[model samples]
Each structure stands twice: as C-alpha cells, then as structure tokens.
Target: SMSNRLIFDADWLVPEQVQVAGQAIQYYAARNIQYVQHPVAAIQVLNVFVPAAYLHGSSVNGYQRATAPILMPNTVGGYLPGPADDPQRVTWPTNAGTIQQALKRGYVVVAAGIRGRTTVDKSGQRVGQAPAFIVDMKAAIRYVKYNQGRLPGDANRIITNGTAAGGATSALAGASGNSAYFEPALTALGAAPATDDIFAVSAYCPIHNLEHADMAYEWQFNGINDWHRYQPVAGTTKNGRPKFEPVSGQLTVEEQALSLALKAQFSTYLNQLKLTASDGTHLTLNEAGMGSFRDVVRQLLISSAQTAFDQGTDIHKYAGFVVTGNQVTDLDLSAYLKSLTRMKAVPAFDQLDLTSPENNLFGDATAKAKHFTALAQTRSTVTAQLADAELIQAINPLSYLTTTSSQVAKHWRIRHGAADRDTSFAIPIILAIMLENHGYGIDFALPWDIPHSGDYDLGDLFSWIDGLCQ
Candidate 1:
C-alpha cells in the first residue's frame, strides 16, 4: 500500500521538524492538501500545522488530546488570489501573526489558501468570485471537521482569523454556517459533508458588506473629503501593482452632492437595523449621523485613547480631544474625522467603470465585474446594471446576525484601527452591535492611531484566544 501510494498523498498525516518563530520546533506540516475534489484554482488547498508530540526530541506546547482549539488563519488581501503560505513554519505578516504563538500556546494552526476575485479557471472563466473565496474557506472548515478523529485539533473549536478581505471572509464563514445559500456550491465542489460553523472569529479591519460599503463610507466621511487625499489608482497598475501619484482629497461638486445623498441614505439604513448595545439601548442614526450608535463609537474610541494615554503615548500630538487630568473626557468627532487621510474616493467600494476588485468579486464566469448596488449601477458606466443580489446577501455576515435561526459564532473578537479608512468605522461597530444584540459574546475595540493593518496587538489577541479556547 505504501509503495503504490502517490508522492503528494493527501492522507499522509505525519510529524515533520520545522522552524517556527525562530525556534527549532518540530511540527506536522501537511502542505497542499486540497479540501475539495475539483479546485477552481491552486489556492484551494489546506495546510495543517500540528504541534509535534513530545517525542523525537521535539518541544511540546501542551498539545496531546484531539480537543485542542484549532486556529484557522487565512492570508487574503485586497480580495486577490490568496495562495497558501510557502514557509510552513512562518506566521502572518502582522505583528500579531500568531501561528507560532498559537502553537506554543497549544493551539493547532490550519492555514488555508482561498481563491480570490482575480483567480480564473483554465478556460479563462472568472471562477473565483463573490462566494468562491468564502465557499473555499467554509470547505476548509468542513474538511478539518470531517477529519475530527484523525486530525489533531478539536473541530468544534475552530477559530477563524484574517485581515482586510481575509477578515471579511473569516467573519462570513463564522456567520453563514449551514445557511443553505452556499449548499449548491459546496455540493458542487464535493466539499466534506461536515459542519463549517466556527466557534469564534477574529476579524481585523474587515472590508465587508460590499453592497453597502459605499454608503457606509459616505456616511462616515461625507463632508470631510477635502481634508485629506492621496494618489488614486483607478485600477490595478500595469504590472498588477497599485500605482501612486500625487492627488488631492477634494471631490468634484457633483461628487460632493452624491456623497451627501449617500450619507443621508446611510442614516435611513441605520435607522432600520433595530440594533441595541449591551445595555439594551436602542441604536439609531439622525440626519447628521449622530445618535446612541455614534455615541457608543465615540465612547469606544475614548476608551482606546485612555488606554494609549495610560500607556504613555503622547495624546497631545492628536488634537480635537478634551483630555483632563490624564483622562480623555470627550472628543470632537467632527474634527477627528477631518484629521484622517481619506484613502478612497466618493463611492468607496463599488467604484464606477468596473475598476474595483470588489466589482470583479461580485462577477461570475461570463461577467468579470458587476455593480452590486443600485446607486453604482445608475451612476457608473457599466454593462451589467444589477449584481447578483442574492449572492451579495449571502456573503454578508450582517444578514445572518439579524436572523435568530442562524447558527452564528458564539464568540467574536473584532478590531478596527482608528486610522483605517478602508471601510467606515461604522461598519465594524454595526457588525458588533448586531451580533451583541443577538447575545453573542463580542470583544470589540478600536486601537488608536493604527491604520489599515492587523496583528498589532498580539498579546491581547492571544489572550482572548486563550480565554475562548479555555
């Protein structure tokens, strides 16, 4: 049987010595184990990293039983092709890249590569689109669960983690488990017939809810477009790199008008959410986008500011905040908004001319890009008028949060940097509230002065991971 087996055997689950975080650690590294039978792209493989059992002179991190929590981390950025990690023992790119950290803490790390918007099949079909990445991730989760007894970690305790687009995918995986919206696709891929629902989710600066992302962006930074700006690349550069040239933050008068309209529309959407804080206070947005919802956001920032101040960060460098006796009393939210350098233009997510990666994400095999929102459809020059609204709705974690019948992740640790303009600060707050309203245990916070980044607070994050795992 062994002589007849293939070289890259999918069932070869053996321990191998690999370096992790500069430590000469021994681990079981399974590389390029495809989770599905027919992979649209090569990025649909799952790599498992198991802490070496305390034999073969390998160091141990207290991992023995099959009940140890599994850390399923994906490294997808900008909704691009997320290939599996090359260096098996390496961690994520961020400071909190905790693959080695988790292993040392006795958690198995399963890093899976998911097909992104740019990935295409052999026939030049846009195979990896809207639901493809999420579907691949869900399939990875199911693959791990299906190998419950054979695998090292507990399938019931799978924790999803990622940043940016990856973050959004992680949150979607946590929220959309067993939703049946993805059943047809999952069945088509021949994904393991196991539950994909995760125990917890850790999302950092997740640019999600693409259909509503533009409105949310305008709602967050409508009037202050001129305060900050940069060189804008309408699309990918010649070499598929992001081009940078000096640009102004000022929007056209027509764009400003559209921004105001979108901002007001956002208030309408916010008012309909019917969400509440932990204190049971009803959340709503006024014409100026002010309410308990904004208040809670401000308070959260203030908490972060206070933490920074106590940690000896020079809070005086940042203006527009009322700090008294070494405590942040209040903040001028308007002035703070003006302080940020706006990263995106008027319509952030669903850009016109079908230039956005997200546009391609909502596309299918035939159409490479489509407008997911009505405003973008009317405003932009696009061949396709409307996006697959059903597919858009399926990827949004917020949709499942509002539904009581959905088997959502019980534990969530979500973080958005205060300086991150990828999506609005409103996005993550809205996500947390909706889940918290449904009685989900959420650890939501904004790290002050941080940008569109992740893994900065490894200590706090791993602590949360430990608590949840325990």
Candidate 2:
C-alpha cells in the first residue's frame, strides 16, 4: 500500500526560463519523478513543466491554472530508450520546438519516459518487452490523475503525443485506456489507483498494426521490388548529422513470390475489416489488391497534392499524377510509390531473420527476440518462436477500438507524411476510418512531400487541441 500511494508536492517544481523566438518564457519544472511505485528500470520517470502564469491565478492564451490542458509528449523512437523531456537540451529550430510552444500556449507539459524492448533488469533479464511500454504509460497517466487537484492542469484533458514507435504508443494508450488486459501488470507494478483514459491522441507516422504490417507493406509495394535502401553508417557527416549509406537491390524470385502471398493475405484482412469511406462506399480490397480502398488512398494523395499546388509548388513533376486545369484529379499509386522509393524489402516488419525492431518489441523475458506473425514464424531462417497471441493483441490499438470495455479517447489527430515509407498508408487510413466510424472526432491527413517525422506542425496541432478544450 505504501508503494502505491503517491503524493504530489507542489513545492517540487523549480522555476526555469527559456528563450523562444526572441521572447523569454518562464515555467516551472519537475524532472525525473518516477511514476511507477516499484520501478524496475531507471527510465520509468517523468518531467512536468507548467507555465508560470499558473502561480498568479492568471491566464495565458485564455486558459487559467486549473483549466489548462496537460500535454504529454513522449520521446520514444524505434522502440528505444526515451529519457525524460529536458527543454534545456532541445536543439529544435526556434519555431518548431514542441515544449516551447506548449508552455507559451499555457498548457502543462508532461514528458514521461517508458521502457523499450532492449531494457533489462539488474539480473540481465529482458524487462521492457511487448506490453511493458504501454503499461508504464498508463501508469504515468494514472499518476497525473491521482494528483488531480494538486496539479496545475485538468486531469480530464491529458493529450498523448508521439512519433513512430512513440506514435504507436499514443494510439494504443488512447485506445486501450482502462482495459482489463493491462490491470494485472499495472497492479504488479504498483501503478496508482486511477483511470488511465486520455482526452486525445496526436500520432505522427505511427508504424502500428505490427502483426499485419508485413502484409500491409507488401500489399502497397507488391510489384515494385527493386529499390535503394539506406542503412546508417558508423560515422557522422561533417554537418554533425548521422550518415547513411544507400544500397540498391531487387528481391529474389522466391522473395517476389512471398510478396504476392503477403499481398493476398492483406486483401483478405482488409476485406474483413469492412471499412467504409466518408461517402458510404465500402472500402474493400479484391484478391488482386484493387478496390474502393485504393480510391480512398488516391483521394488522400490528390488532396495533399492540391494543397501543395496551392502553396505554389509544382505538382506535375511526378508523371503518375493526372493534373487537370491546376487540379490533381487522379494518381497512379504504384508509380507514386516508385518515385517515393520503397524503404524496406519484402516482409518489412517481422523479418524472417528476427532482426527487425518490432520482432524485439514482441520478445519476452526468456527470448530476446521472437516472431509475432505466423508467416514469419513458419518462414524463419533460424530457430524462432511466436509470441503469445494475447500479448500481441495487447499492443495493437485496432484490437481495442471496437470491442473494449475501456474508455477510448474521442479526439484524435493523426498525420502521416505523404512521402513517408516507414509504414503503409493503409495502416493510418484504417485507423482514422475506424475511429470515425465509431463516432469519434478525428483530423487525419497526409501532409504533402513530408517524411517520417513528428511535431513539425505545432501551430496546427495546438489549434486542434485548443478547439477540443474550448
């Protein structure tokens, strides 16, 4: 009982200041406060930053101390270690800093660190495996709610934000809030007794639906196999950025056949989802991967192109686009992907060699990495085992959207870059469609020519949050 009881100390915050766009902004900081009672790893802490306006019972951007929304931005990437947020160390361009903008807008910022696949305990045993990240995040949300009255912001207005693997975390956290599947783990970790449901989710380029990502990837890039793939080099460039080496190759005849098989599997999976577009058209994929679903993807691309064209960029550079009278009317999805360049080989996510980051994400205490899909398990190049089905289900947001007893967040803002090749557009499309069909308010889009990144459009993001709060 002692372990589970957490008290908020208002005096824990220390005053801090930072220059944002030539203006000094004052805030209060609380760093590295562990959210879980029995912490197994050092990264289970969080940082809270509150606007100084809260001290004088004043308002910044029309939100007072008790009315301001809490913004939770995770630092996770590639399922790796994400330390607590430190605004002092931020090197983002002046206008693009997330923490800076949130404080300026009178929002309470919480940067919670969670364990990843590679995290190990003192005994050298794997600890931060499949469900550990989500469990820890829920615990952190509970911590915020447990101290509701003492905290500066509203506990009912917690918004989760992340990119890539962190984006997957945000989506899953928003969807699976208060589900019974995570209760045992939460209890064992001594998580505070509070509901973990969130107010909103902001996911950027989330590579989710991992158990079926390979099929989705192959479905989008079935015939286009030959491409250049980039791998990080050991050294950095002269500009102090990481270096990458590009190697080109085509899939083997066997791998090409595997692509076709995976594509067929995706067709089955997509059809079973029984998704519908905004206009009530059934979005289903035929055996050959052609259907109204493709139409939906084409419309998204055209919309993105239209925006870019309106911004004075030449949208006709790509031969795949059919521009009529300055309007993007049609898109050849295959040619567009070719110009975009395929990022991975066949079986993008669940590698046959068990080398992918997702494979490690699904690993357990005994095994460092294992296959999470039946296809990858059966076609393993080494001695491999499949992860538990229930564990696999626990990490996927789609599993909880329609059939969970938990309280799902009603507001969602999902953005995937048009040029991002990290995961299939189908993944985010299905996520947005499902949320909309379930009567949730979602602002989903593919920003034109953007790549796999997050928090780029802070103005638009905060505006969305503001709309909901008002």
Candidate 3:
C-alpha cells in the first residue's frame, strides 16, 4: 500500500506523520471507496466519497475546503483506474468534501475504493451482480487498521454515507452484516482476515429492505436499480484485462445484465456494443439471460412488485436517521473558524458549493419567513401523503417501534415528497431501531422535502455512531 497521508495534496498525496508520547502517528487518505476496491478491467477502483482531515491540524468545520466524488464502476472489466488526471477534481457515488468533515473532528479519513476498479451498480437488485464490494469495504477497514503509523480510528467511530446506489452500499457495510469489508486487500497482501466490527452505519435515501419497500411510494418502473453485492475478487483471481476496452465504457459492465429483461422486452434500446470482463465474462443478457442472479431474488420481488396492503389515515412520522446533539462532528469550531478566516480555504466547502448549498441568516425577518415557508411546504406534503389512508398504517414512528430499540427513539423528523411512491416511511423504523439502543438524549433530524441524505444531517449520523460504539 502506498504510504497515504492524513491529508492529500494538489496532485499526489503528501503523507504526514507525527510522534506523540514516543508513539509515531500517521493517517492514510484516498478518495472513492478509499481506493479499497480496484476496478478489474482497468486499474480504476470504487470508493465512498468524502473529504478527510487526517493531520493534527485536520478538522471539518462549517467552513472548510472539500472535494466532490467520481463514483466508481463495479463491473469486472471496466475502466483503467489511477489518480484521475484532472488534478483537483472529485466525483459522486463518493464525495471527498463530506469525508473531510469527519477529519475536522479528528478522525483519520481514507476515501477507500473497492478492489474492482469500477462502478458498483446499486440502483436496485441487479445492477452490479457480485459481492466484491463487501470485500472491498473489508480491505479498506483493514488498510486503516494495519497501517502502523496511521492514527487509531475509533474502532466504532467509522461511518459511511452515499446516495442512491452508494447509499445502499454504505448501509450494506453496516446493516446486512456482510463482514467482509476488508478481505480484498488482505488477499492482495497475502494475509488472513483480521478481527473487527464496523463501528457505526449511516445512510440517506438508502435502499433498505427493498423487498419491503412499498412501491406505492413511487412507481419504480425502470428507475429502480440494485447491484447485488460483488463476490470477493480475491479468493477468485481471473485474468486481468485492460480497464477500458480502448473504446467506449458504455459496454463492458453488468448494467446490461440488469437491463436484459428490459432488453428482451425492449431490445431495441440496447442497440449497441460489446461488454465483457477480464475473464471473458460477457455481460450479454441476450446470450445468457439473468445468469446467477439468485442472491437478490428477494430484493427483486420487493423492488419489482410490492405494494401497500392498505392505507390508513395517520400522520406517519418515520424516525429519520439524524442527530441534534453537539458532539456529532466534535470539531473544534473555534479553531476551524480561526483558520478559514486567516487563509482562503482552497479545497473544502468550495467543493460542496457551500456558497449556494447553505442558507444565510438575514438581519430582517428573512429567517422567520424562510422558516415559515419551509414549515408550510412540509405540512402540505405530509398532510396529502397521509390522506391516502390506504398506505397509512398508523401515526408516527412510535407506532412501528415494537422492540425495545424502537421505543428508545424519541427524536425523529421527516420530509418525504407529496407522493410516498419513491421513498417509504422506513425512517421511522430506523429511528425505532436506533433509539431502542440509545434514548431521547439524542435527536433524529428528518428532512421533509429532499430525498435521502438531503433529509438527514450527516453529522448527526456520525454522533449516533459515537453513541453506539462508545
């Protein structure tokens, strides 16, 4: 493994090391799945996006430079991977800027990539078919652990966030309990699997219990996509092919595999190209119709044809995955402001477009009006959603909390669109699950309009991890 630093630089990474009380400390940093899973076709790999502050002076404050993420491809033979040439560029599926927020609070961040050097189709149940991502995540965790000079991450403080497909992966890393978030790298180094438990799990608009996800929430026609986790690329070593086909990336992936059913139904749309993995595993749905897709069959059923048995008149308040406490980011706010004001933050908030993303407080009644408008809009949508009464099972998250954990959730907020067809009221369930573990002293801030991460605050999610792991 390259000696990554607690902080990355302009082009390559500048590793930073410090000695504390006779102990040397170091922090590894990378972007996109933390480079955990390298792409198979080319050297390119998958990653969870976020900025990381690994040095002693690292801190994620309200104001800081952050990076955007370029999501990775998960197909066996995909694009050739490397340090993306566009020096200061980042992409989504992985957001480097957000990761920095954790670092701001004193956590070593490594934007890890899965072993396979490509994107993992996480739309629904058939995007990327293998379980390599689990291995890739395991590799990333191990890399963090084994690096001698690396700072010791709170065994329980680690958390992940992603949108759409990546969000599903982040949840899988923590929830489904794949338990293989680091096997890929272990095999690469000729080592055995180590012992560790994922500290905390967080996600927004995640693909949870899709089998149970109510389709009435949204008519998922062809939009729903999911890449059943990738199988470990380590135990099975196939031929290494070029990342790119020396041609277009449109082909050479499992996306078509998923669309095969759609193809037979509408083959005309998939009119072009040759796609195959390094092992000559052609992703041709026409030739091999949905081969080896048994794993996510259950999820497929839910994504494809699940509906609300009936709706009831109830103001269903799904407990969102959020945090209202101050400990979430744990950054030295005073210190962070001091730095941002002194120097022009080169690579932090600039990435997220904070100038636009955040709302400003005005001297006049702008704040009150803004608050009223937000609240009114939220009320209108929430009211209409409950009117269905058919999908309305009951009122609020508490109604769903049957277990002790469910009862523990006291603070929850939500913001689903007018129609409950796209997303469901699972946030309430998540709250019950979380609060049942840790009680009311905490709050779950839910969003009423945006989807997934948009509705929940990432910092609060981190704080939850702290409570669980602590």
C-alpha lDDT score of every prediction, in listed order: 0.78, 0.87, 0.30
Q: State the lDDT at 306 in candidate 2.
A: 93
- Whole-model lDDT, candidate 2? 0.87
- Residue-level lDDT of model 2, residues 1-470, one tens digit each, is 45545777879889999887899999999888878788899889888899998977799998988989999888777887666776775422111268888999889988888888888888888899888889989999999999897888999999999999999999999999898999999998888889999999999998899998999999998888786667787964443345678887889898899999999999999988888887887799888999889888889999999999989987766658888887878888888988888888878999999899998988788788899999999999989999999989888999887742439998999999998988999999999999987788899999988998899889999999999996
Q: Write one digit per residue (lDDT tens) for candidate 1, span 1-470.
A: 22311123325656665455687655667777878876667778877777666223343444454667888988788888676753343333322236666666677777888888888777777788878889889888888888786767778889998899988988998898887899889888878778888899999988888878888888878877674544556764333445556655578898889899998899888888888776777888899888887888788878888989999987666666789987899988777777765668878888878888898888787787888899888988656756777888888889898765447889999999987878998899889888878878889999988988787887898788777766
Superposition error at 124 for model 3 (Å): 22
Q: Given candidate 3, what's the lDDT at residue 132? A: 40
With candidate 3 superimposed using the best TM-score fit, by how many Å does residue 126's alpha carbon deviate from the native? 12
Total colliding residue pairs, candidate 2: 0
Score candidate 1 by lDDT. Answer: 0.78
Per-candidate TM-scores read: 0.90, 0.96, 0.39
Ranking under lDDT, best-scoring first?
2, 1, 3
User: Could you give the candidate ranking by TM-score, starting with the highest?
Assistant: 2, 1, 3
Cα lDDT for residue 102, candidate 2: 91
279 Cα displacement, candidate 2 (Å): 3.5
Which one wins by TM-score: 1 or 2? 2
The residue-level lDDT of candidate 1 at 433 comes to 84
Which of the two candidates, 2 or 3, achieves a greater lDDT against the reference?
2
